[PDB]
Amino acid sequence: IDSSAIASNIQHHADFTPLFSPEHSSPLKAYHATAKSVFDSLIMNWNATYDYYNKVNAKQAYYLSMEFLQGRALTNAIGNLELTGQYAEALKQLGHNLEDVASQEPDPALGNGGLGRLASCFLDSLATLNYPAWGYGLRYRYGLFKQIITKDGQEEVAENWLEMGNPWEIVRNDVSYPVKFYGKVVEGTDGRKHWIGGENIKAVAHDVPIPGYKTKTTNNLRLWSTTVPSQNFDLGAFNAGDHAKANEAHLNAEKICHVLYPGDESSEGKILRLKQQYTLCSASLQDIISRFESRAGDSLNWEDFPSKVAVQMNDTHPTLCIPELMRILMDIKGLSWNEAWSITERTVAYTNHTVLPEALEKWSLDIMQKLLPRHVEIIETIDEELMNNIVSKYGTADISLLKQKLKDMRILDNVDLPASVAKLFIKELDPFAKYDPQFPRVVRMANLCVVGGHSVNGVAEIHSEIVKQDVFNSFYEMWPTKFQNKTNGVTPRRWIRFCNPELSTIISKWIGSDDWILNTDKLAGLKKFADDEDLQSEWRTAKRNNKMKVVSLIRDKTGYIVSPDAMFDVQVKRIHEYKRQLLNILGIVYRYKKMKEMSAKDRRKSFVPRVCIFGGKAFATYVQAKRIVKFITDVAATVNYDPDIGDLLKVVFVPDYNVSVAETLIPASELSQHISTAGMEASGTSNMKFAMNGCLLIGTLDGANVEIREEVGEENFFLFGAHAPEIAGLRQERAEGKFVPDLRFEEVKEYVRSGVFGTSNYDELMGSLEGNEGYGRADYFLVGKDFPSYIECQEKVDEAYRDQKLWTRMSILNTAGSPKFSSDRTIHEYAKDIWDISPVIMP
Amino acid sequence: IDSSAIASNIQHHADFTPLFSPEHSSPLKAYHATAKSVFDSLIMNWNATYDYYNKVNAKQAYYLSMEFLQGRALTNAIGNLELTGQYAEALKQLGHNLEDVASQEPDPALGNGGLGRLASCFLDSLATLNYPAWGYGLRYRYGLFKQIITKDGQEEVAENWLEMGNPWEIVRNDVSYPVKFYGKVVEGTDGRKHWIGGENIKAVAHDVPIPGYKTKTTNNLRLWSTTVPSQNFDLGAFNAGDHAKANEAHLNAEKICHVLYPGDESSEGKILRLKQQYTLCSASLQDIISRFESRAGDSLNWEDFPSKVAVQMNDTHPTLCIPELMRILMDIKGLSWNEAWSITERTVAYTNHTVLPEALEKWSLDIMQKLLPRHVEIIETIDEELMNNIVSKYGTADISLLKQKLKDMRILDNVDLPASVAKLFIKELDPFAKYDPQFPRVVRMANLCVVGGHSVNGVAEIHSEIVKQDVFNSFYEMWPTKFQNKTNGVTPRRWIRFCNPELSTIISKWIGSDDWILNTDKLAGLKKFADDEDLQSEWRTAKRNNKMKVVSLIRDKTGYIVSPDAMFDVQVKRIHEYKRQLLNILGIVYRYKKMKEMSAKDRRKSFVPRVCIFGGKAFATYVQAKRIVKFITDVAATVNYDPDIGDLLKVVFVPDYNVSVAETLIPASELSQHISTAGMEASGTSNMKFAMNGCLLIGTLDGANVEIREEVGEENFFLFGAHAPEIAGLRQERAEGKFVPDLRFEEVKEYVRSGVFGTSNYDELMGSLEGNEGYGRADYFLVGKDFPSYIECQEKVDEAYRDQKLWTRMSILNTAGSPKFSSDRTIHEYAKDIWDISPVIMP
Ligand SMILES: C[C@H]1O[C@H](O[C@H]2[C@H](O)[C@@H](O)[C@@H](O[C@H]3[C@H](O)[C@@H](O)[C@@H](O)O[C@@H]3CO)O[C@@H]2CO)[C@H](O)[C@@H](O)[C@@H]1N[C@H]1C=C(CO)[C@@H](O)[C@H](O)[C@H]1O
Ligand SMILES: C[C@H]1O[C@H](O[C@H]2[C@H](O)[C@@H](O)[C@@H](O[C@H]3[C@H](O)[C@@H](O)[C@@H](O)O[C@@H]3CO)O[C@@H]2CO)[C@H](O)[C@@H](O)[C@@H]1N[C@H]1C=C(CO)[C@@H](O)[C@H](O)[C@H]1O
Ligand SMILES: *Cc1c(COP(=O)(O)O)cnc(C)c1O
Ligand SMILES: *Cc1c(COP(=O)(O)O)cnc(C)c1O
Ligand SMILES: OC[C@H]1O[C@H](O)[C@H](O)[C@@H](O)[C@@H]1O
Ligand SMILES: OC[C@H]1O[C@H](O)[C@H](O)[C@@H](O)[C@@H]1O
């Protein structure tokens, strides 16, 4: 397969699967054609993988998530096929430039943050390692939002990634499943339950092939798009004039796939958010059930189901899988409860990504009882069993103990106990065993996940322990063997090899192969070359060359002009008080103030030149987070155009941060910040990406930083701030008026309140770092406390950067210490210790 | 190009431009693949035709219509490419059957009745004869409606023809034009008018290639699909919960293409109906303007516009082209009024399809003034000129004369006259020259078409004369050279060659070539063979063989079982009191009654066995038309299951009549009915289709029947009923109580009122044939008057059918007399006498 033939197939797709006029000439047009030419390879390989999986009928794993941050497919598809050189030349022939063409591809708006990017990285590694595994998701039209930066801060625009269609998917019109909303349950002649009536939609399959690296294995991401058949369009309504009414039925179905994480401060938003989940679970399980059946054929035994199927619920969003699977087995296939439940408990597993026990999904029983009444019946039964198992394992004898065990583990909170358990609380019945209308009737989804899965895991050593000790303690006591750890990882193909080709050449030279891309353990061979002068020279050149593409990005996106000969200091993550963008910007503001009260000779002596880059999206409704992006932009306007500063310091907020932005930013980064309040982050995947590219980390002892620090070495990581255990106490200390801040912290607050950063003044923002008690005040995320520790830790970063021998030594040790954080070994662990699947290699 | 290669390309499209799972196996799946394989040929040819038209820059013709009844594309594409034999074999290889595959294609819901089917036939003939010509239309999603027959009569279901996408179109993403609604006009610095504000949508192009027969020429049907850019989606509205509000902007744009002829008894339906038209006109003219400019390049002279462009407004729906063209020339290109108007008058032309002067499109000025204010300004100016030209040509001297000329020709009725004309009516001003609020302010679109076009034509000799004498008399007096005739035609490739292959073989044998398909004049060589016994034998066999496919259709669609050894008597057209389905069914009911009051020996002696087939759609809101389909179905239920009748008589209502149904029905038809009240039909295209297939016509002296009768011979056409001139008098005779019906007509009415046809009784329906005066009563369409003439004319049809020598003799003379009714010569006439275009043959 040479470049001359690819050039023909690109031309062919431009003209014979066309989207534009023939005489029209666009980089974009070249993209859709090039996309389709690569896609031909994925189809061949996808069909081969599909067909051979059916033959072998091995256990298949299924990863359900509400997010898939897929990113641009072109550069990684071509890379994994190893046609990256020849496609480039094929495009020269046609008067195009691969890099330039690739940058016309829009980012699929199928995800948002870590949850989704993990999932996507997991799909790459599953394919690359020949594991039989699909992802199931939903096909979002507008996604979360396209972020634009005005002079008012952030604004939100709905995404346009499907406007011309997605070349990377295949519609499967034969694959349509019915999904039902509302309705009621009745008991038919045959003793069996039947869910009738309500509202009915159809989920249709849109497949996105996932090609593996140096393998024919091409796995799949099956994406549901909701609709209703044209016949549900009401002509009477339309011809009468009421055009919205005529379209109402279609809107109801279609809106399930409109927006990611739709705002739920309205009963109609909660119902939609809930329909999104049930749709994903139901459609996906119906499809999985169908595959099991067609493969098993005549010799069909449902006891084989969990040895042929593994479902993985990513976070609590897919919880409904549990009762839904029970629904189909009993109501549709005619299994008994115990036979169905045994299969369910062994099929399903749960991964938790939160460290806080009050960030776990809860739903009003009333809302759920209305929308999915059959599922509540089933949940009710599950909760009754759960409680009879707690009864067996503890009490009658000690009741107040039993009382505590039952609160912790119940799925339905503030509900009348079943007559069985209720007995044990008579005096008549204790207040505890009755519904109290003063509070809502709530369904706790995390608890239902733990009850329903055979395995529960966290995403970092520290976090998986918090999960056992704080979050699900009484459950761990009951079922200790459930609980596991699976530290996250990221694919080295997207996050080193293809986003950082310059570094990748350097790596393969000195290690003596490019095999590290696949077997990333062989990066450790770099430890010994850390001090070698020549390596250091190539390594600094590369970093510098990668920074020049960011100069183009900043120039292009913001308008600001920045020099690549500064430290590229990057904080890039969702805007939140707890992630503490505010801590970083206030630290920059401190250095700015010092520069201004210092002679132009001394400014150079005291501070290394920096380009401090922020990025990320603020939840639209989050007032304070949006004020924070506003504030940062204002600092940039003031700092960047100040004659006294020049190129000594620039502050930039890159808009619309996404996979494509990260791909340019990350390889160019020298310092990255991961400074969340200690014990608030569960893992963090960007941490791992940065280190792989030789970027140094400044951060707290929190999440993935803790293990990253172990692997790369404590000497090569800038640590600061309060540790997780110290936190609760520092806050209680604050509440009783005992916290007195550093004078330098009050200095900055007053210097911000001075009005130096525009007409905004921000007395309100600084007000969130003051007082001793109250929502949104009282410095809950310890910005003032960690401040002195932090700015002093930044002085150590300056002083290390002064010795580019030391800096680059540490840079190389970070790449050399990254092997542990490859999603490849994360997948192995999942495959071996949870799903119990094996790889399937086609001959 | 042999069948072995086509079989590969079909397989290729199934697997490499897929719509289904790979293991899935469907006739439907085979269709989408086969469609795409043929399409490869159309693309090649379309691009060649497109490119060569640009080189030659000849005058191009443009046919605007709100309807295109395209029909299934597969059988006609393959036919026109002459790959019809090899595609059939290519499909045998893959385990499929072309006929069976073809029948999986859905009918595009892009039209409805004659207006649209004419347009489509016109596009075939334009391509076949190498004329440079496009069609411009709109891309309807749900169309008019899918008709289903229940036991309640007709019901309407929205169509599903786009549910899996149209394989026969190409989206042209670079071709998008902005269209504006509401807004206001202001005069900018540069003396020029500027239309600002309002609502803005975009029309995107979806091209449908039109391949010609035995030519590479592939012309185009450009179809506009309305939308707005994703950014107009309101996330704030969506996240707040108001999901319809968030989607409102998209609904407004998208609904313009939802339904054909949306119900307009509501101000919101009228506004939509009006937006549909403006969108079609604006988008299309902007595109035409763009093509003229790019071709002309540097040497650009707008005086050349009408020698390089011809627009044809089909009916009054595209009238807005006139002021829209004026808008762009003056406001956008900077032409003066006279320079713009001269170009407009010579570019545009109008075809009229109505015989009634009160069936001509009128719009409220207020509604138009709100939606398109700039166009009303322009119309106002046009009407003022028009009136100053009437002033020149008539009056001041005779004023009451002038008064009459001004009523007849005004575009804006019930509006204050311009100060110029108003002068002439002082006493102060005459009531006539003032707005009278007692009546609406109306814009008469037909008059604006006549003022704005260089040519005005009817669609039949008789009708084109009515147009000159009754409808536009004062205009004919003023501009006699405007007025023309262009008798309709239908393509012989779709309506003989491809729908009736059995007859087509017979034709080519005896004429000694298949060249008649193209040069249809050579059907006249059949006159001499009309009596030859052998021809007659093959000819009757064919007709009989074609009737057996209708037996399958009836069995399949209705459930009824019918014998092909009866007379296939077909009335197939839109359900309307004026088309008089009621006259036909009451005539059948008369024969049924006679059969029942007659011995089983005599039933055979008196009547020939028949299968009487009805078809067509009733306007949903038309109460009486819907009662008529109901009544017919009830007669069928009673007649078809009556032991006394057996196979002597069957009545069938075939549901969902469309192009595909006509293609099976027409070639099987022996008698077809065209019995509209005399002088109510302008032409009729199905008339011409039937005769071409050797079907005999029973009809009134009305529309296309008059010329069909001339061509095939009066001896070979069953004529009955009152002539057009007699009508007005018969109605006035009715109003003054002088009409006394035939006793046999009162007999049937009472026999229907008897309750013999179910629990419905229909006293209401028969009530519409009674009284002397009043809306919906008084037998306005002369059913009772023409009845005796009609049933006696059916006795003559029976007696002719008895002698199958005579019947088949006349059948052959009908085919032999059809040459005049080929759309080919219709097109030549349009090309030569109106558009002034020439054919363009690529070397
Ligand atoms: C989810 C939420 O977490 C954080 O909220 C915490 C408050 O900051 C604390 O003050 C504390 O609340 C305590 C009361 O102040 C105290 O008087 C007593 O009644 O106990 C309360 C215990 O809750 O604890 C809160 C939660 O643990 C954080 O401040 C806040 O930003 C977080 N919510 C944001 C997230 C979203 C969604 O992305 C937005 O919708 C919210 O508006 C944001 O505020
Ligand atoms: C368009 C309409 O045409 C026909 O209507 C005619 C009436 O049948 C006549 O009675 C006559 O109306 C006259 C009054 O009865 C008389 O008292 C005097 O005031 O003069 C009147 C003059 O109009 O003339 C009418 C029009 O020339 C026909 O009966 C009717 O079916 C036709 N409309 C149908 C079409 C559609 C759209 O497809 C439906 O919306 C209507 O409901 C149908 O009725
Ligand atoms: C990797 C990645 C993230 C996750 O970063 P965290 O440190 O987990 O916040 C978010 N967004 C994008 C675009 C990414 O590539
Ligand atoms: C030709 C045709 C018509 C037009 O028939 P009229 O005699 O003009 O009513 C209507 N519908 C279909 C499907 C046709 O093919
Ligand atoms: O922000 C911390 C992130 O850590 C990891 O990426 C988790 O997988 C994700 O759920 C979480 O959001
Ligand atoms: O029904 C009579 C028909 O005659 C012809 O087909 C005309 O083109 C069409 O406008 C009209 O509807």
Author numbering:
A (entry chain A), B (entry chain A): 69 to 495, 553 to 968
Tell me what the authors wrote about this structure, in their words.
The third crystal, soaked with acarbose and G1P, has no ordered electron density for either substrate in the active site. Some disordered electron density is present there, and two fragments in each monomer have been interpreted as glucose molecules in our final model, but they probably represent the average electron density of a mixture of many species, possibly including solvent water and glycerol. Correspondingly, the 422–427 loop is in the open conformation as in the native structure. Acarbose molecules were modeled, one for each monomer, in arc-shaped electron density going through a gate formed by Tyr900 and Tyr905 and adjacent to the active site. This gate is already formed, albeit unoccupied, in the native structure. The acarbose molecules have their non-reducing ends overlapping with the position of the glucoses in subsite +4 in the maltotetraose soak. Together, these two crystal structures define a path for the acceptor maltooligosaccharide from subsite +1 to subsite +7, at which point the maltooligosaccharides would extend into the solvent.
Quantitative data about starch phosphorylase protein abundance and enzyme activity are lacking and no crystal structure of a plastidic plant starch phosphorylase has been reported so far. It is known that starch phosphorylases are members of the CAZy GT35 family of glycosyltransferases and catalyze the reversible transfer of glucosyl residues from a glucose donor onto the non-reducing end of an α-glucan chain. While Pho2 is localized in the cytosolic compartment, Pho1 is a true starch phosphorylase that acts on starch in the plastids of the plant cell. We determined the crystal structures of HvPho1, the first crystal structure of a plastidic plant starch phosphorylase. A native structure of HvPho1 and two complexes with acarbose and maltotetraose were solved and refined to resolutions of 2.7 Å, 2.9 Å and 3.0 Å respectively.
